[PDB]
């Protein structure tokens, strides 16, 4: 049974066609500022990456979007945590999938994942994207 925070992450990465709300993402970001919920969020987000998928591309895409937001808004400790999983994230760099509609869903996943990894591994980029985030906020 999912805790409240694991439920929020689940919802933010569910199978609905539309993206998660920025407010829901912020709520989850708040959870990165305590140890328990930081680990809850972590588990939940990467669970998604590990199910090599066809139509589960969307849940993976939404997990990437969330993780981008969290790197820009979340606790510094959460970036530290996430860095310990770069290996697992890298797996997505080869994600390929065209759906039954003839739509290439994989190209979005790969381009998002490449951007996130560039972000995660660069203190200068992180510092800059954090600055911007909190200015517009």
Which of 94, 52, 92, 51 is CA-nearest to residue 68? 92
Q: How was this structure determined?
A: X-ray
CATH of the domain at 18: 1.25.40.90
Distances (CA, A) of 26 to 64, 77, 88: 15, 16, 24
CB 75 within 8 A of CB 33: yes
- Return the bridge partners of 104, or none: 98
Longest CA span, the chain: 43
What phi, psi does 75 have (nearest 5°)? -60, 150
CB 61 within 8 A of CB 115: no
Residues 6+ apart with CB under 8 A from 104: 97, 98
> What domain range includes position 65?
1-137
Residue 66: how many CA atoms within 13 Å on its side-chain side? 33
Which of 63, 66, 5 is CA-nearest to residue 34? 5
Report the distance separating Cα 49 and Cα 61, nearest Å. 9
Domains in the chain, number = 1
Distances (CA, A) of 101 to 34, 62, 68, 82, 97: 42, 20, 28, 34, 11
Residues in the chain: 137
């Amino acid at each position: 049974n999912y805790t409240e925070m694991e439920g929020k992450v689940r919802e933010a990465t569910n199978n609905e066609p539309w993206g998660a709300s920025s407010t829901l993402m912020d709520q989850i970001s708040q959870g990165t500022y305590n140890f328990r919920e930081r680990e809850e969020i972590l588990s939940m987000i990467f669970r998604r990456f590990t199910e090599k998928a066809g139509s589960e591309w969307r849940q993976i895409y939404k997990a990437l979007q969330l993780l981008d937001y969290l790197i820009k808004h979340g606790s510094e400790r959460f970036i530290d945590d996430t860095r310990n999983s770069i290996n697992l994230i890298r797996i997505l760099e080869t994600f390929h999938y065209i759906d039954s509609q003839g739509r290439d869903q994989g190209i979005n996943v790969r381009t998002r994942v490449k951007a996130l990894i560039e972000l995660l591994s660069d203190d200068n980029k992180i510092r800059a994207e954090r600055k911007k985030a909190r200015e517009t906020a």
